[PDB]
Design an enzyme around this catalytic site. Structure first.
Site, PDB file in Angstrom:
ATOM      1  N   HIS C  41      -8.484   7.232  -3.845  1.00 11.26           N
ATOM      2  CA  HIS C  41      -7.823   7.169  -5.310  1.00 11.26           C
ATOM      3  C   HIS C  41      -8.061   5.787  -6.218  1.00 11.26           C
ATOM      4  O   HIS C  41      -7.960   5.745  -7.325  1.00 11.26           O
ATOM      5  CB  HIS C  41      -6.491   7.175  -5.132  1.00 11.26           C
ATOM      6  CG  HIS C  41      -5.567   6.177  -4.824  1.00 11.26           C
ATOM      7  ND1 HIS C  41      -5.105   5.707  -3.447  1.00 11.26           N
ATOM      8  CD2 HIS C  41      -5.227   5.171  -5.751  1.00 11.26           C
ATOM      9  CE1 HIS C  41      -4.369   4.446  -3.621  1.00 11.26           C
ATOM     10  NE2 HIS C  41      -4.573   4.134  -4.946  1.00 11.26           N
ATOM     11  N   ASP C  90      -6.916  10.294   1.237  1.00 19.49           N
ATOM     12  CA  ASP C  90      -7.138   9.221   0.436  1.00 19.49           C
ATOM     13  C   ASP C  90      -7.887   8.184   1.277  1.00 19.49           C
ATOM     14  O   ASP C  90      -7.328   7.269   1.671  1.00 19.49           O
ATOM     15  CB  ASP C  90      -5.764   8.566   0.205  1.00 19.49           C
ATOM     16  CG  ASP C  90      -6.047   7.620  -0.903  1.00 19.49           C
ATOM     17  OD1 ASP C  90      -7.029   7.425  -1.549  1.00 19.49           O
ATOM     18  OD2 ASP C  90      -4.836   7.044  -1.461  1.00 19.49           O
ATOM     19  N   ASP C 186       6.856  -4.273   2.277  1.00 21.54           N
ATOM     20  CA  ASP C 186       5.964  -3.035   1.897  1.00 21.54           C
ATOM     21  C   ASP C 186       4.702  -3.511   1.370  1.00 21.54           C
ATOM     22  O   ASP C 186       4.606  -4.654   0.763  1.00 21.54           O
ATOM     23  CB  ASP C 186       6.567  -1.907   0.946  1.00 21.54           C
ATOM     24  CG  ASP C 186       5.876  -0.816   0.752  1.00 21.54           C
ATOM     25  OD1 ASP C 186       5.040  -0.324   1.763  1.00 21.54           O
ATOM     26  OD2 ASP C 186       6.347   0.157   0.078  1.00 21.54           O
ATOM     27  N   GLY C 190      -1.817  -2.577  -6.184  1.00 23.38           N
ATOM     28  CA  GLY C 190      -2.673  -3.249  -6.064  1.00 23.38           C
ATOM     29  C   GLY C 190      -3.583  -3.616  -4.694  1.00 23.38           C
ATOM     30  O   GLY C 190      -4.582  -3.944  -4.560  1.00 23.38           O
ATOM     31  N   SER C 192      -3.988  -1.275  -2.382  1.00 21.40           N
ATOM     32  CA  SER C 192      -4.598   0.132  -2.226  1.00 21.40           C
ATOM     33  C   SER C 192      -6.166  -0.151  -1.872  1.00 21.40           C
ATOM     34  O   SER C 192      -6.706  -0.990  -2.139  1.00 21.40           O
ATOM     35  CB  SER C 192      -4.609   0.934  -3.345  1.00 21.40           C
ATOM     36  OG  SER C 192      -3.305   1.456  -3.832  1.00 21.40           O
ATOM     37  N   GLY C 193      -6.453   0.590  -0.517  1.00 23.23           N
ATOM     38  CA  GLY C 193      -7.673   0.357   0.022  1.00 23.23           C
ATOM     39  C   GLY C 193      -7.706  -0.640   1.091  1.00 23.23           C
ATOM     40  O   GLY C 193      -8.682  -0.629   2.111  1.00 23.23           O
TER      41      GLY C 193
HETATM   42  C1  LIG Z   1       6.630   7.707  -7.843  1.00 27.42           C
HETATM   43  C2  LIG Z   1       5.158   7.551  -8.734  1.00 27.42           C
HETATM   44  S1  LIG Z   1       4.410   6.285  -7.686  1.00 27.42           S
HETATM   45  O1  LIG Z   1       5.351   5.129  -7.321  1.00 27.42           O
HETATM   46  O2  LIG Z   1       3.166   5.905  -8.415  1.00 27.42           O
HETATM   47  N1  LIG Z   1       3.912   7.004  -6.095  1.00 27.42           N
HETATM   48  C3  LIG Z   1       2.838   7.826  -6.161  1.00 27.42           C
HETATM   49  C4  LIG Z   1       3.111   9.288  -5.288  1.00 27.42           C
HETATM   50  C5  LIG Z   1       4.043   9.986  -5.938  1.00 27.42           C
HETATM   51  C6  LIG Z   1       3.795  10.969  -6.887  1.00 27.42           C
HETATM   52  N2  LIG Z   1       5.022  11.798  -7.294  1.00 27.42           N
HETATM   53  C7  LIG Z   1       5.890  11.042  -6.624  1.00 27.42           C
HETATM   54  C8  LIG Z   1       7.395  11.509  -6.374  1.00 27.42           C
HETATM   55  C9  LIG Z   1       8.275  10.844  -5.526  1.00 27.42           C
HETATM   56  C10 LIG Z   1       7.856   9.890  -4.460  1.00 27.42           C
HETATM   57  C11 LIG Z   1       6.261   9.525  -4.650  1.00 27.42           C
HETATM   58  C12 LIG Z   1       5.336  10.017  -5.609  1.00 27.42           C
HETATM   59  C13 LIG Z   1       1.751   7.216  -5.856  1.00 27.42           C
HETATM   60  O3  LIG Z   1       1.625   6.150  -4.781  1.00 27.42           O
HETATM   61  N3  LIG Z   1       0.447   7.656  -6.325  1.00 27.42           N
HETATM   62  C14 LIG Z   1      -0.763   6.955  -5.776  1.00 27.42           C
HETATM   63  C15 LIG Z   1      -1.774   7.184  -6.806  1.00 27.42           C
HETATM   64  C16 LIG Z   1      -2.268   8.849  -6.824  1.00 27.42           C
HETATM   65  C17 LIG Z   1      -3.807   8.840  -7.301  1.00 27.42           C
HETATM   66  N4  LIG Z   1      -4.525   9.659  -6.747  1.00 27.42           N
HETATM   67  O4  LIG Z   1      -3.852   8.389  -8.454  1.00 27.42           O
HETATM   68  C18 LIG Z   1      -0.483   5.325  -5.997  1.00 27.42           C
HETATM   69  O5  LIG Z   1       0.048   4.866  -6.663  1.00 27.42           O
HETATM   70  N5  LIG Z   1      -1.165   4.488  -4.838  1.00 27.42           N
HETATM   71  C19 LIG Z   1      -0.943   3.034  -4.570  1.00 27.42           C
HETATM   72  C20 LIG Z   1       0.252   2.844  -3.969  1.00 27.42           C
HETATM   73  C21 LIG Z   1      -0.356   1.961  -2.799  1.00 27.42           C
HETATM   74  C22 LIG Z   1       0.862   1.456  -1.741  1.00 27.42           C
HETATM   75  C23 LIG Z   1       2.218   2.083  -1.911  1.00 27.42           C
HETATM   76  C24 LIG Z   1       3.372   1.592  -1.161  1.00 27.42           C
HETATM   77  N6  LIG Z   1       3.123   1.180  -0.017  1.00 27.42           N
HETATM   78  N7  LIG Z   1       4.529   1.802  -1.619  1.00 27.42           N
HETATM   79  C25 LIG Z   1       2.716   2.918  -3.173  1.00 27.42           C
HETATM   80  C26 LIG Z   1       1.528   3.206  -3.912  1.00 27.42           C
END
Ligand SMILES: CCS(=O)(=O)N[C@H](Cc1c[nH]c2ccccc12)C(=O)N[C@@H](CCC(N)=O)C(=O)NCc1ccc(C(=N)N)cc1
Ligand SMILES: *[C@@H]1O[C@H](CO)[C@@H](O)[C@H](O)[C@H]1O
Ligand SMILES: *[C@@H]1O[C@@H](C)[C@@H](O)[C@@H](O)[C@@H]1O
Ligand SMILES: [Ca+2]
Ligand SMILES: [Ca+2]
Ligand SMILES: [Ca+2]
Ligand SMILES: [Ca+2]
Ligand SMILES: [Ca+2]
Ligand SMILES: [Ca+2]
Ligand SMILES: [Ca+2]
Ligand SMILES: [Ca+2]
Ligand SMILES: [Ca+2]
Lengths: 191, 142, 254
Positions: C41, C90, C186, C190, C192-193
């Site tokens: 992602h 991912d 947690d 940023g 990510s990866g």
């Molecule tokens: C809530 C939006 S969000 O916070 O951005 N979460 C979404 C998932 C997500 C989408 N809809 C939802 C509904 C309920 C719970 C989770 C989700 C989410 O995580 N989306 C991805 C990108 C998806 C893409 N391919 O673009 C993202 O933001 N990844 C980065 C990331 C890394 C670590 C953590 C962590 N350890 N914490 C959280 C996020």
């Protein structure tokens, strides 16, 4: 496969065994145990039994709180067990009156300091060694009218009527405990 | 136990329950009281569950009310000490003692292996680096 | 990283900094002198595929020293099954244009065999996650590489111990949860990866990739990481393949 259920701890004097259901049919089990911050350790690998001895694991630190889980094989299906804190939950075994000698108008009732499964320097520690001050013994006797006594050691020193005969019975007790505070009554002994 | 006329004699715990097996009624005649007789009978009639000698591999049986407890020799465990701690050398068990990779082998014993950049030592379980910067190691701490 | 601490310079030698057009993009993990494992992602909105940079031996983004090594990313391989904007599969394998020099500050994390990881590493309670991600949900990113020790959970427990939400993504077999549900610790966006590294008998292994979660360090929720054990074969086969014409490559999975 079906996830195990009714996981129950059967522990006495620290001999600790995990039991569960149902009687496996075309499925084997593997158990894992650990402390909240430790790694998971597997036990009773691919057993068809519905029990698993975890004694050697919990006696490593009887004051830690343990969690176990049973995997089922035809991530795998599993079920967590109730938390188990040996020190606070292991049942006190049935006591044994070791002896009693009369000295005039008094009698000394000694309680056998039975051993537990807790190892230490190539030996088995006694209930006293493990619980120390947390353990007391209660006496329930009578002139052969109920009578009781308590001691923080393994002996009772009580008064008796010359000539008359008495019968004795004791129980192991950990006052602070909430559950399994007392052991069953020991066998009855009379002078 | 009862023999011709003995019941004419007062109750005796020693003569009746110790030197012989006494029924509940005979025990009742000695203790009289209900609770007392029951407190005595629960243990007297429980029966030694250790009579079967259930504790295997040189373990020791400790009798309890309607049950027993086995104390095992160091190399043993299990309800009846039936488990051979030395017969658990399989990969799922603590990675088979291998430092890195473990491979099971039905009929024989498991063998250990290492990741690229490492070699298996003579002990057959440990791995040592064969390069200056092996993976998974932190130089400033080594 | 939320609730963690600075990783002493040199103690997170496999951590990778990914940049696009010189801008911070994501974290990554070095597994040999030429390949880096990251998250798929991280490339959802990339346009200039020729401006991807991977920096090794980084630590303090505000001071340059000789332990830093920059390389152009010559190839970004992503599973054909990954869908931009979503969470499953991912993962990304990056080929550096030129191998990096292994030093005391730049070392690869070990990619373990599949069964070792599933059977042993997956049951090691704690593992390290790191990155220059946000210190707080929606906050600013870190200047110094942060690290956090997090506990792993089997998926059944994750689901049972998490607040059920409306349209949250499913936690598949290609994922696993790790962290805390009390809102204190947690990894974050940023990060990510970045690697989820597991220590086992003297050696560190790659078990996960910072992937997703509900916000960052949100009460009743855990961080979710790509379950690397499922891609061991996929990764090894690709590391033996010949480079492709373009940067982006979608390879079949399984
Ligand atoms: C809530 C939006 S969000 O916070 O951005 N979460 C979404 C998932 C997500 C989408 N809809 C939802 C509904 C309920 C719970 C989770 C989700 C989410 O995580 N989306 C991805 C990108 C998806 C893409 N391919 O673009 C993202 O933001 N990844 C980065 C990331 C890394 C670590 C953590 C962590 N350890 N914490 C959280 C996020
Ligand atoms: C000895 O007696 C006990 C009584 O419970 C039995 O469970 C064992 O199987 C036997 O060996
Ligand atoms: C009872 O305990 C077991 C472990 C062995 O030591 C036996 O010899 C003893 O009688
Ligand atoms: Ca008689
Ligand atoms: Ca009689
Ligand atoms: Ca009689
Ligand atoms: Ca006699
Ligand atoms: Ca007789
Ligand atoms: Ca009668
Ligand atoms: Ca009679
Ligand atoms: Ca008995
Ligand atoms: Ca820098």
């Amino acid at each position: 496969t079906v996830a195990a259920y009714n996981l129950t701890w059967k522990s006495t004097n620290f001999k600790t065994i995990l039991e569960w259901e149902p009687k496996p049919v075309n499925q084997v089990y593997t158990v894992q145990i650990s402390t909240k911050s430790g790694d998971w350790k597997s036990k009773c690998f691919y057993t068809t039994d519905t029990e698993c001895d975890l004694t050697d694991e919990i006696v490593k630190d009887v004051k830690q709180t343990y969690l176990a889980r049973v995997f089922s094989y035809p991530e795998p299906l599993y079920e967590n067990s109730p938390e188990f804190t040996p020190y606070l939950e292991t049942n006190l075994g049935q006591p044994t009156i070791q002896s009693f000698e009369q000295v005039g108008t008094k009698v000394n009732v000694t309680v056998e300091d039975e051993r537990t499964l807790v190892r230490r320097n190539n030996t088995f520690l006694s209930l006293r060694d493990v619980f120390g001050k947390d353990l007391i013994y209660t006496l329930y006797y009578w002139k052969s009218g109920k009578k009781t006594a308590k001691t923080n050691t393994n002996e009772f020193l009580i008064d008796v009527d010359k000539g008359e005969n008495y019968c004795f019975s004791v129980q192991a007790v950990i006052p602070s405990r909430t559950v399994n505070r007392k052991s069953t009554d020991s066998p009855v002994e009379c002078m | 136990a009862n023999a011709f006329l003995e019941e004419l004699r007062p109750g005796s715990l020693e003569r009746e329950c110790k030197e012989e097996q006494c029924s509940f009624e005979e025990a009742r005649e000695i203790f009289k009281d209900a609770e007392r007789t029951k407190l005595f009978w629960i243990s007297y009639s429980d029966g030694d569950q250790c009579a079967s000698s259930p504790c295997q591999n040189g373990g020791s049986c400790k009798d309890q009310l309607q049950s027993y407890i086995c104390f095992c020799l160091p190399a043993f465990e299990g309800r009846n000490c039936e488990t051979h701690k030395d017969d658990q050398l399989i990969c799922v068990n603590e990675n088979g003692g291998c430092e890195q990779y473990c491979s099971d082998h039905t009929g024989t014993k498991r063998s250990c292996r290492c990741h690229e950049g490492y070699s298996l030592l003579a002990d057959g379980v440990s791995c040592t680096p064969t390069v200056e910067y092996p993976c998974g190691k932190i130089p400033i701490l080594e | 990283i939320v609730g963690g601490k600075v990783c002493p310079k040199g103690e997170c030698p496999w951590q990778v900094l990914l940049l696009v057009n010189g801008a911070q993009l994501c974290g990554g993990t070095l597994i040999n002198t030429i390949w880096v494992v990251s998250a798929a992602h991280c490339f959802d909105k990339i346009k200039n595929w020729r401006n991807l940079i991977a920096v090794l031996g980084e630590h303090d983004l505000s001071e340059h020293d000789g332990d830093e090594q920059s390389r152009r990313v010559a190839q970004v391989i992503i599973p054909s099954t990954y869908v931009p904007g979503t969470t499953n599969h991912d993962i990304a394998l990056l080929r550096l244009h030129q191998p990096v020099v292994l030093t005391d500050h730049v070392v690869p994390l070990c990619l373990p065999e599949r069964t070792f990881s599933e059977r042993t590493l997956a049951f090691v309670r704690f593992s390290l996650v790191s990155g220059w991600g946000q210190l707080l949900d929606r906050g600013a990113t870190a200047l110094e590489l942060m690290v956090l020790n997090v506990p792993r959970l089997m998926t059944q427990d994750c689901l049972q111990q998490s607040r059920k939400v409306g349209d949250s993504p499913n936690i598949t077999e290609y994922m696993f949860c790790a962290g805390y549900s009390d809102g204190s610790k947690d990894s974050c966006k940023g990060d990510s990866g970045g690697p989820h590294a597991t220590h086992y008998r003297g050696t560190w292994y790659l078990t996960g990739i910072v992937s997703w979660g509900q916000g960052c360090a949100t009460v009743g929720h855990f961080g979710v990481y790509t379950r690397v054990s499922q891609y061991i074969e996929w990764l090894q086969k690709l590391m033996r393949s010949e480079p492709r014409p373009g940067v982006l490559l979608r390879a079949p999975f399984p």
